[PDB]
Amino acid sequence: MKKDIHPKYEEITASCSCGNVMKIRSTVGHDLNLDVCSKCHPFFTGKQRDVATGGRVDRFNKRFNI
Amino acid sequence: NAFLEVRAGTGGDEAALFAGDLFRMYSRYAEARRWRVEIMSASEGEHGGYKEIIAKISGDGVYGRLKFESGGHRVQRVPATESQGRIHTSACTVAVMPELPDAELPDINPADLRIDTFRSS
Amino acid sequence: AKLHDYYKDEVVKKLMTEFNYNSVMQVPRVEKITLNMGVGEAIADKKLLDNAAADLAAISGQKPLITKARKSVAGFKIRQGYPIGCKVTLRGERMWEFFERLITIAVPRIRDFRGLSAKSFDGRGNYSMGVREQIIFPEIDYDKVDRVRGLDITITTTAKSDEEGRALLAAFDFPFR
Amino acid sequence: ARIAGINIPDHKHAVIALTSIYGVGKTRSKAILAAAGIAEDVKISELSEGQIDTLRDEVAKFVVEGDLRREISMSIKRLMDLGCYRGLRHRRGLPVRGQRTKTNARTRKGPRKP
Amino acid sequence: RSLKKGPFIDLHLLKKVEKAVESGDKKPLRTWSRRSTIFPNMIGLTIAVHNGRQHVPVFVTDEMVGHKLGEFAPTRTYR
Amino acid sequence: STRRNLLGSGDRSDRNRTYNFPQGRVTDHRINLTLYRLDEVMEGKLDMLIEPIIQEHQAD
RNA sequence: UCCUCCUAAAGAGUAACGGAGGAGCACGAAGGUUGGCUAAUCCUGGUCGGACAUCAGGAGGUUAGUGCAAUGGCAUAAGCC
RNA sequence: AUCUAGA
RNA sequence: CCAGGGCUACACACGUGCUACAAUGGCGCAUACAAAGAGAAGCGACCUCGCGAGAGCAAGCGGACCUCAUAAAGUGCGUCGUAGUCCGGAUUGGAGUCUGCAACUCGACUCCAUGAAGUCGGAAUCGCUAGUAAUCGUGGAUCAGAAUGCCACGGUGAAUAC
RNA sequence: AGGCUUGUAGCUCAGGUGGUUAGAGCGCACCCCUGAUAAGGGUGAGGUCGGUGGUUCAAGUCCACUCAGGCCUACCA
């Protein structure tokens, strides 16, 4: 890099509520709060629920019952 | 194809207002059989309708379906411009002229042309 | 950084087991990342690209170049030499750290998220995606800014074709629906 | 304060602030703050993260900002593909619920342009 | 939105479906019943519902189940 | 030359139809038709008007 | 009046109210020197972004550029910084 | 400013 | 005579209205103060269940006694601080409940999500002189269901006329 | 025949010189005034700038090419 034209690149500490700390280098400022990350996020259960939504005859069966 | 052309007759305001309502009648007829109707010219009346409205109708055998409407059309009603409420009798007149396309107006054939070259004066 | 130190041992070996290279230098390795932001609306608002470049300086690490119209076009009212889009070709250590900060805290914060696509390969082994907003990066307050501004990350890898480059990123557990 | 997409209020009381999420209005917000147990007239400025973690999973129970758009659009796109009455109304932008269409309907049928 | 106890049909439609179970396939079964819901066992059939002047034949499918028949026979014909 | 022959004199001496709104009646003078329609004429639907004239025109 | 091509017949020159086009300037840098660089146009992928803005790669190899008319040239570059 | 033509 | 459809269609125009554009307001809680009516192949307590429309058993009453029927604007206390917003409620998606043989065209009503046009309105334009205008709720006829209309009733309650 | 000059909204004209943006009067459509029309008042749409091809980053404009209209010249014999 060059000098005195680039911004700061302080190594700060990350934090999500999940319990997954990985300290990383940027110019956020002081601290890093998160709620989701590469883990503790529905990348693998939210990519399962959006597909299966159809199905209608068993709805009609949930109103006769006999 | 044909030229449907409705001129208003006696009763120059009321039958203008009625020639509006013959033009809407064949207008409603040509749309039924899917024919193109197009108002080529329209002299409007005073209180609605037209003193003459010449409108080309193209389509599929327009002339043989509509050649019988040429003539007068006498209209017994209470008018719109009638403040005493009695019957008035008017008339509209329609013509229907056929398509009749064009051919080349001169035949410039110089074998018909006697060319007479003489001295100038 | 840390997934470069995961690269050099487990992703190199992770691909040496898969596409059975008789050499090692035949493994792909990600060359660079070129964050573009083609702001465009510097023709009408000249001081827009000040902050539109100041965004890339805070998203990425370093100071951006502000690039110019190659040949002038009258479809968009730009004369040749007009500053129309700011870019950063980061490489080296900062590319592993921006990529590591990409798949950890930047990818999962995308609103209405499906998973990144896999057809975003150019048929060469180079992945190129586009992001809509700024706020998948924590450096943006969401309160300090006012613009709907977004960029489009271009991952450049030295693979021969994209059958290989999809394996290189998917060995980094890259999303790929 | 980033639940289910964005959620950025400013000095607004908590039940009014949680309305901002697509998929919860006034009632379901009181179901959140009833279940997750936060007082109603506290503010998301005051509401610290050790309180919010009880809400990022609590609004996550009912379908919210993300998955509800493709729930709803999935049902609409279903109706258009049926070719029933109502999908034949969604194709055109005429009112589905049997309104007047002679005179009114400028919500469903757009502005009064022609 | 309708009739919480008993999804509604008519006997002249329903027994016609019952005979359409063992009849195999048929030409469209001329029914004027619109107020009846479609039972799930009618899939594969092609009953024709009266819109008011003509019977439009409609193929009962897994998507088109709990809806009534008159959903799928538009009466008024516009432009 | 032809339009003058077809477009009549304009005056009300009956020339090839009437349109009688108080009685509701329509009479085309030829094939002295006596249709009482006048709402089935004033939106097209003069099929019954024209058709006996073309029949009694293919009569000759 | 002047410049460029063709007529002009493989040196030069060569007419016509022969065929085609430009000039009556610009530039203190668009001059010098050193150092660096290489296009046009398509295809693939990509935020609004679009056939046509910026990005990355590939094809292509001067079809580009040359302050302005045409010819002659020009990568050692005379083109770009 | 004008308001045709059927007591 | 019969079944299905239609009178509810929708490029648009006109008439009357209802809800609004908000802070003399919205929302949450506590609370006060009426008139006029209707009721038996009717009104329907009480108690329970349901988030809510409502569902179960059901006392009374052809009624100054029983039922609809908690009147609301009001007052007190918070709250939101001028934002297309805790304004506004269309439009839509899903699940409901009633009546009726039947709720698709085409019923009303509830719950949850939805949250658009709209920031007092051009030229013109209408009603209104006092318990009037304005505003607030309630009842009846028609009627199985189905009014923002009609017909009636009370609450608060003005400025103005030279 | 050449020489000079028009062509822009449905009509009549600016806009063209000065290359990056299309306006005016009347007409037309919609709503008021009116017993109803005209007048009037309020609101609105309406153009690829005669067709063809170059230059240019871009053509309504700038150069050729025409097409339809107009004026002038066409003499000495």
PDB file of C-alpha atoms in Angstrom, chain C:
ATOM      1  CA  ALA C   1      -5.646 -14.604   6.297  1.00  0.00           C
ATOM      2  CA  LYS C   2      -6.902 -17.495   8.353  1.00  0.00           C
ATOM      3  CA  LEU C   3      -8.606 -19.139   5.440  1.00  0.00           C
ATOM      4  CA  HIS C   4      -5.443 -18.544   3.488  1.00  0.00           C
ATOM      5  CA  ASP C   5      -3.814 -20.567   6.242  1.00  0.00           C
ATOM      6  CA  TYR C   6      -6.685 -22.981   5.693  1.00  0.00           C
ATOM      7  CA  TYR C   7      -6.020 -22.729   1.960  1.00  0.00           C
ATOM      8  CA  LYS C   8      -2.308 -23.635   1.921  1.00  0.00           C
ATOM      9  CA  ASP C   9      -2.851 -26.900   3.803  1.00  0.00           C
ATOM     10  CA  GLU C  10      -6.417 -28.160   3.497  1.00  0.00           C
ATOM     11  CA  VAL C  11      -7.757 -26.572   0.334  1.00  0.00           C
ATOM     12  CA  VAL C  12      -4.658 -27.391  -1.682  1.00  0.00           C
ATOM     13  CA  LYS C  13      -4.848 -30.984  -0.426  1.00  0.00           C
ATOM     14  CA  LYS C  14      -8.656 -30.847  -0.657  1.00  0.00           C
ATOM     15  CA  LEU C  15      -8.357 -30.262  -4.386  1.00  0.00           C
ATOM     16  CA  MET C  16      -5.340 -32.531  -4.935  1.00  0.00           C
ATOM     17  CA  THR C  17      -7.552 -35.389  -3.797  1.00  0.00           C
ATOM     18  CA  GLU C  18     -10.370 -34.348  -6.126  1.00  0.00           C
ATOM     19  CA  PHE C  19      -9.090 -33.450  -9.591  1.00  0.00           C
ATOM     20  CA  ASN C  20      -6.006 -35.702  -9.181  1.00  0.00           C
ATOM     21  CA  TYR C  21      -3.358 -33.276 -10.442  1.00  0.00           C
ATOM     22  CA  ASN C  22       0.013 -34.934 -10.928  1.00  0.00           C
ATOM     23  CA  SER C  23       1.610 -31.597 -10.058  1.00  0.00           C
ATOM     24  CA  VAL C  24       0.704 -29.284  -7.218  1.00  0.00           C
ATOM     25  CA  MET C  25       0.954 -25.937  -9.059  1.00  0.00           C
ATOM     26  CA  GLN C  26      -1.956 -27.120 -11.215  1.00  0.00           C
ATOM     27  CA  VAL C  27      -4.237 -26.401  -8.253  1.00  0.00           C
ATOM     28  CA  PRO C  28      -6.256 -23.171  -8.591  1.00  0.00           C
ATOM     29  CA  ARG C  29      -5.475 -20.262  -6.340  1.00  0.00           C
ATOM     30  CA  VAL C  30      -7.507 -17.120  -6.155  1.00  0.00           C
ATOM     31  CA  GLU C  31      -5.583 -14.332  -7.818  1.00  0.00           C
ATOM     32  CA  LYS C  32      -7.422 -11.163  -6.909  1.00  0.00           C
ATOM     33  CA  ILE C  33     -10.793  -9.559  -6.232  1.00  0.00           C
ATOM     34  CA  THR C  34     -11.924  -6.451  -8.120  1.00  0.00           C
ATOM     35  CA  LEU C  35     -14.700  -4.554  -6.345  1.00  0.00           C
ATOM     36  CA  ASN C  36     -16.365  -2.370  -8.946  1.00  0.00           C
ATOM     37  CA  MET C  37     -18.914   0.343  -8.262  1.00  0.00           C
ATOM     38  CA  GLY C  38     -20.047   1.930 -11.532  1.00  0.00           C
ATOM     39  CA  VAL C  39     -21.742   4.950 -10.037  1.00  0.00           C
ATOM     40  CA  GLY C  40     -22.785   6.554 -13.307  1.00  0.00           C
ATOM     41  CA  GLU C  41     -24.624   9.495 -11.760  1.00  0.00           C
ATOM     42  CA  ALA C  42     -21.603  11.689 -11.580  1.00  0.00           C
ATOM     43  CA  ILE C  43     -22.838  13.386 -14.756  1.00  0.00           C
ATOM     44  CA  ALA C  44     -25.631  15.184 -12.903  1.00  0.00           C
ATOM     45  CA  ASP C  45     -24.312  15.140  -9.338  1.00  0.00           C
ATOM     46  CA  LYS C  46     -20.554  15.610  -9.571  1.00  0.00           C
ATOM     47  CA  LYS C  47     -19.870  15.282  -5.839  1.00  0.00           C
ATOM     48  CA  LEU C  48     -21.654  11.923  -5.646  1.00  0.00           C
ATOM     49  CA  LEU C  49     -18.562   9.857  -6.501  1.00  0.00           C
ATOM     50  CA  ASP C  50     -16.653  11.436  -3.595  1.00  0.00           C
ATOM     51  CA  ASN C  51     -18.787   9.464  -1.174  1.00  0.00           C
ATOM     52  CA  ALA C  52     -19.333   6.669  -3.687  1.00  0.00           C
ATOM     53  CA  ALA C  53     -15.565   6.079  -3.659  1.00  0.00           C
ATOM     54  CA  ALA C  54     -15.410   6.790   0.080  1.00  0.00           C
ATOM     55  CA  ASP C  55     -17.731   3.813   0.510  1.00  0.00           C
ATOM     56  CA  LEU C  56     -15.313   1.375  -1.171  1.00  0.00           C
ATOM     57  CA  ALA C  57     -12.492   2.768   0.924  1.00  0.00           C
ATOM     58  CA  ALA C  58     -14.337   1.602   4.039  1.00  0.00           C
ATOM     59  CA  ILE C  59     -15.909  -1.615   2.733  1.00  0.00           C
ATOM     60  CA  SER C  60     -12.570  -2.876   1.456  1.00  0.00           C
ATOM     61  CA  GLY C  61      -9.238  -1.833   2.896  1.00  0.00           C
ATOM     62  CA  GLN C  62      -7.725   0.785   0.687  1.00  0.00           C
ATOM     63  CA  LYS C  63      -8.201   3.895  -1.417  1.00  0.00           C
ATOM     64  CA  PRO C  64     -10.057   3.495  -4.711  1.00  0.00           C
ATOM     65  CA  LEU C  65      -9.201   4.453  -8.234  1.00  0.00           C
ATOM     66  CA  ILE C  66     -11.952   6.419  -9.992  1.00  0.00           C
ATOM     67  CA  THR C  67     -12.134   5.307 -13.603  1.00  0.00           C
ATOM     68  CA  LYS C  68     -13.058   7.021 -16.837  1.00  0.00           C
ATOM     69  CA  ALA C  69     -15.144   6.585 -19.957  1.00  0.00           C
ATOM     70  CA  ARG C  70     -13.194   4.563 -22.526  1.00  0.00           C
ATOM     71  CA  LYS C  71     -14.952   5.727 -25.677  1.00  0.00           C
ATOM     72  CA  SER C  72     -17.634   8.345 -25.280  1.00  0.00           C
ATOM     73  CA  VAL C  73     -21.269   7.323 -25.708  1.00  0.00           C
ATOM     74  CA  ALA C  74     -24.283   9.527 -26.334  1.00  0.00           C
ATOM     75  CA  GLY C  75     -26.698   7.022 -24.883  1.00  0.00           C
ATOM     76  CA  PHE C  76     -25.745   8.151 -21.380  1.00  0.00           C
ATOM     77  CA  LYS C  77     -24.536  11.763 -21.844  1.00  0.00           C
ATOM     78  CA  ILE C  78     -20.909  11.096 -20.934  1.00  0.00           C
ATOM     79  CA  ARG C  79     -17.940  12.669 -22.668  1.00  0.00           C
ATOM     80  CA  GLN C  80     -14.686  10.728 -22.902  1.00  0.00           C
ATOM     81  CA  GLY C  81     -12.610  11.008 -19.772  1.00  0.00           C
ATOM     82  CA  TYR C  82     -15.481  11.417 -17.362  1.00  0.00           C
ATOM     83  CA  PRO C  83     -15.213   9.812 -13.897  1.00  0.00           C
ATOM     84  CA  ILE C  84     -18.009   7.261 -13.982  1.00  0.00           C
ATOM     85  CA  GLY C  85     -17.107   4.289 -11.764  1.00  0.00           C
ATOM     86  CA  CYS C  86     -14.752   3.614  -8.862  1.00  0.00           C
ATOM     87  CA  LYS C  87     -12.917   0.323  -8.383  1.00  0.00           C
ATOM     88  CA  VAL C  88     -10.471  -1.457  -6.105  1.00  0.00           C
ATOM     89  CA  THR C  89      -8.350  -4.369  -7.294  1.00  0.00           C
ATOM     90  CA  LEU C  90      -7.249  -5.612  -3.916  1.00  0.00           C
ATOM     91  CA  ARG C  91      -4.840  -8.510  -3.817  1.00  0.00           C
ATOM     92  CA  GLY C  92      -2.286 -10.152  -1.570  1.00  0.00           C
ATOM     93  CA  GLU C  93      -3.106 -10.425   2.120  1.00  0.00           C
ATOM     94  CA  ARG C  94      -6.040  -8.026   1.921  1.00  0.00           C
ATOM     95  CA  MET C  95      -7.774 -10.216  -0.631  1.00  0.00           C
ATOM     96  CA  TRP C  96      -7.750 -13.177   1.694  1.00  0.00           C
ATOM     97  CA  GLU C  97      -8.965 -10.943   4.464  1.00  0.00           C
ATOM     98  CA  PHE C  98     -11.713  -9.315   2.413  1.00  0.00           C
ATOM     99  CA  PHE C  99     -12.765 -12.715   1.107  1.00  0.00           C
ATOM    100  CA  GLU C 100     -12.665 -14.145   4.628  1.00  0.00           C
ATOM    101  CA  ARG C 101     -14.693 -11.158   5.812  1.00  0.00           C
ATOM    102  CA  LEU C 102     -16.971 -11.750   2.816  1.00  0.00           C
ATOM    103  CA  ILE C 103     -18.084 -15.324   3.451  1.00  0.00           C
ATOM    104  CA  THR C 104     -18.298 -14.812   7.219  1.00  0.00           C
ATOM    105  CA  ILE C 105     -20.150 -11.577   7.949  1.00  0.00           C
ATOM    106  CA  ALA C 106     -21.124 -10.220   4.534  1.00  0.00           C
ATOM    107  CA  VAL C 107     -22.806 -13.061   2.624  1.00  0.00           C
ATOM    108  CA  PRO C 108     -25.302 -14.118   5.354  1.00  0.00           C
ATOM    109  CA  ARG C 109     -26.485 -10.542   5.958  1.00  0.00           C
ATOM    110  CA  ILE C 110     -28.090 -10.272   2.517  1.00  0.00           C
ATOM    111  CA  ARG C 111     -31.796  -9.451   2.722  1.00  0.00           C
ATOM    112  CA  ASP C 112     -34.244 -11.986   1.220  1.00  0.00           C
ATOM    113  CA  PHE C 113     -31.410 -14.452   0.850  1.00  0.00           C
ATOM    114  CA  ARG C 114     -31.551 -17.491  -1.385  1.00  0.00           C
ATOM    115  CA  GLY C 115     -28.007 -18.621  -1.350  1.00  0.00           C
ATOM    116  CA  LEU C 116     -25.565 -17.352  -3.923  1.00  0.00           C
ATOM    117  CA  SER C 117     -26.051 -18.635  -7.428  1.00  0.00           C
ATOM    118  CA  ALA C 118     -23.708 -20.997  -9.209  1.00  0.00           C
ATOM    119  CA  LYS C 119     -24.305 -19.894 -12.795  1.00  0.00           C
ATOM    120  CA  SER C 120     -22.372 -16.687 -12.085  1.00  0.00           C
ATOM    121  CA  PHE C 121     -19.273 -18.101 -13.748  1.00  0.00           C
ATOM    122  CA  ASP C 122     -17.950 -16.716 -16.999  1.00  0.00           C
ATOM    123  CA  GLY C 123     -16.924 -20.064 -18.418  1.00  0.00           C
ATOM    124  CA  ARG C 124     -13.346 -19.552 -17.321  1.00  0.00           C
ATOM    125  CA  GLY C 125     -13.055 -20.151 -13.600  1.00  0.00           C
ATOM    126  CA  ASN C 126     -13.897 -16.659 -12.440  1.00  0.00           C
ATOM    127  CA  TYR C 127     -16.802 -15.926 -10.130  1.00  0.00           C
ATOM    128  CA  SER C 128     -18.589 -12.608 -10.381  1.00  0.00           C
ATOM    129  CA  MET C 129     -21.539 -11.631  -8.216  1.00  0.00           C
ATOM    130  CA  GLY C 130     -23.395  -8.431  -7.482  1.00  0.00           C
ATOM    131  CA  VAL C 131     -24.555  -7.057  -4.160  1.00  0.00           C
ATOM    132  CA  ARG C 132     -27.482  -4.687  -3.881  1.00  0.00           C
ATOM    133  CA  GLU C 133     -26.844  -2.574  -0.793  1.00  0.00           C
ATOM    134  CA  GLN C 134     -24.019  -1.395   1.408  1.00  0.00           C
ATOM    135  CA  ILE C 135     -25.220  -2.683   4.733  1.00  0.00           C
ATOM    136  CA  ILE C 136     -24.039  -6.261   4.330  1.00  0.00           C
ATOM    137  CA  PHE C 137     -20.776  -4.675   5.463  1.00  0.00           C
ATOM    138  CA  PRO C 138     -20.735  -3.524   9.114  1.00  0.00           C
ATOM    139  CA  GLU C 139     -18.658  -0.409   8.350  1.00  0.00           C
ATOM    140  CA  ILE C 140     -21.801   1.296   7.117  1.00  0.00           C
ATOM    141  CA  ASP C 141     -23.890   2.587  10.019  1.00  0.00           C
ATOM    142  CA  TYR C 142     -27.234   2.349   8.120  1.00  0.00           C
ATOM    143  CA  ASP C 143     -27.809   5.700   9.810  1.00  0.00           C
ATOM    144  CA  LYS C 144     -24.956   7.786   8.408  1.00  0.00           C
ATOM    145  CA  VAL C 145     -25.611   7.098   4.737  1.00  0.00           C
ATOM    146  CA  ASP C 146     -28.499   8.001   2.471  1.00  0.00           C
ATOM    147  CA  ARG C 147     -27.889   6.229  -0.834  1.00  0.00           C
ATOM    148  CA  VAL C 148     -29.126   2.914  -2.219  1.00  0.00           C
ATOM    149  CA  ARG C 149     -25.581   2.386  -3.601  1.00  0.00           C
ATOM    150  CA  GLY C 150     -24.202  -1.090  -4.275  1.00  0.00           C
ATOM    151  CA  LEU C 151     -21.175  -2.851  -5.772  1.00  0.00           C
ATOM    152  CA  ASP C 152     -20.388  -6.127  -7.543  1.00  0.00           C
ATOM    153  CA  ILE C 153     -17.553  -8.383  -6.366  1.00  0.00           C
ATOM    154  CA  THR C 154     -15.483 -10.093  -9.067  1.00  0.00           C
ATOM    155  CA  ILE C 155     -13.492 -13.096  -7.830  1.00  0.00           C
ATOM    156  CA  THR C 156     -10.664 -13.953 -10.232  1.00  0.00           C
ATOM    157  CA  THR C 157      -9.112 -17.406  -9.951  1.00  0.00           C
ATOM    158  CA  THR C 158      -6.427 -19.074 -12.032  1.00  0.00           C
ATOM    159  CA  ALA C 159      -8.494 -22.143 -12.859  1.00  0.00           C
ATOM    160  CA  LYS C 160      -8.690 -23.363 -16.432  1.00  0.00           C
ATOM    161  CA  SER C 161     -12.477 -23.627 -16.609  1.00  0.00           C
ATOM    162  CA  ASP C 162     -15.278 -22.954 -14.171  1.00  0.00           C
ATOM    163  CA  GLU C 163     -15.886 -26.620 -13.369  1.00  0.00           C
ATOM    164  CA  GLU C 164     -12.633 -26.193 -11.453  1.00  0.00           C
ATOM    165  CA  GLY C 165     -13.351 -22.765  -9.973  1.00  0.00           C
ATOM    166  CA  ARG C 166     -16.692 -23.822  -8.545  1.00  0.00           C
ATOM    167  CA  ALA C 167     -14.787 -26.534  -6.697  1.00  0.00           C
ATOM    168  CA  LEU C 168     -12.218 -23.998  -5.480  1.00  0.00           C
ATOM    169  CA  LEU C 169     -14.804 -21.736  -3.903  1.00  0.00           C
ATOM    170  CA  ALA C 170     -17.034 -24.596  -2.761  1.00  0.00           C
ATOM    171  CA  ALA C 171     -14.029 -25.959  -0.912  1.00  0.00           C
ATOM    172  CA  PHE C 172     -14.293 -22.700   1.070  1.00  0.00           C
ATOM    173  CA  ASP C 173     -17.919 -23.639   1.886  1.00  0.00           C
ATOM    174  CA  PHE C 174     -19.104 -20.835  -0.421  1.00  0.00           C
ATOM    175  CA  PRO C 175     -22.926 -20.916  -0.580  1.00  0.00           C
ATOM    176  CA  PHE C 176     -23.817 -21.968  -4.173  1.00  0.00           C
ATOM    177  CA  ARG C 177     -27.501 -22.800  -4.480  1.00  0.00           C
TER     178      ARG C 177
END
